[PDB]
Amino acid sequence: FVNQHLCGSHLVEALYLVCGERGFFYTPKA
Amino acid sequence: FVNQHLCGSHLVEALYLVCGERGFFYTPKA
Amino acid sequence: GIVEQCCTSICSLYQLENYCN
Amino acid sequence: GIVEQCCTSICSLYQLENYCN
Numbered sequence: 886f887v888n889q890h891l892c893g894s895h896l897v898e899a900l901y902l903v904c905g906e907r908g909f910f911y912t913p914k915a
Numbered sequence: 916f917v918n919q920h921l922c923g924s925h926l927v928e929a930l931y932l933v934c935g936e937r938g939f940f941y942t943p944k945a
Numbered sequence: 946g947i948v949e950q951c952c953t954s955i956c957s958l959y960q961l962e963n964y965c966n
Numbered sequence: 967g968i969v970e971q972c973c974t975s976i977c978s979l980y981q982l983e984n985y986c987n
Contacts, residue, residue, distance in 0.1 A: 887977050887978065887979050887982055888976060888977065888978060888979075889976060889977060890972075890973060890974075890975070890976060890977070891972045891973060891977045892969070892972075892973035893931075893973075894928065894931055896968065896969075896972055896973060896977075897927055897928070897931045898924065898927070899972075899977070899982060900941075900982060900985060900986075901923075901924055901927045901941070903979065903982050903983065903986070904982075904983070904985070904986035904987070906943060906944055907944070907986045907987045908940070908941045908942040908943050908944065908945075908986070908987045909940070909941055909985050909986050909987060910938070910939070910940040910941070910966075910985055910987065911930075911931070911938045911939055911940070911941070911968070911985070912938040912966055912967060912968065912985075913936060913938050913967065913968065913969045914936055914937070914938065914967070915938075915966075915967055917956050917957065917958050917961055918955060918956065918957060918958075919955060919956060920951075920952060920953075920954070920955060920956070921951045921952060921956045922948070922951075922952035923952075926947065926948075926951055926952060926956075929951075929956070929961060930961060930964060930965075933958065933961050933962065933965070934961075934962070934964070934965035934966070937965045937966045938965070938966045939964050939965050939966060940964055940966065940987075941947070941964070942946060942947065942964075942987055943946065943947065943948045944946070945946055945987075
């Protein structure tokens with residue numbers, strides 16, 4: 886489900902699902 | 916809308932909305 | 946951590962902004 | 967950055983996992 890255009894809250898949701906208990910960082914500018 | 920129990924994807928969504936173009940980090944374990 | 950402060954107990958704007966970049 | 971790689975162009979699992987802690 887990750888091989889598509891993922892923008893905004895959709896991208897954040899994919900990070901949440903993929904990274905799980907590791908957590909993640911989201912940096913749209915840098 | 917942030918003054919409540921925010922868990923899982925709800926918490927991630929609040930970070931997304933509040934932090935905006937700054938982005939954020941989500942670290943549930945640490 | 947953020948789960949203890951915002952999930953297990955009631956969140957706040959102060960706390961959330963601590964996790965913005 | 968992640969927006970250029972996953973929003974403006976097609977994302978991949980390799981790229982997403984680069985942003986896991």
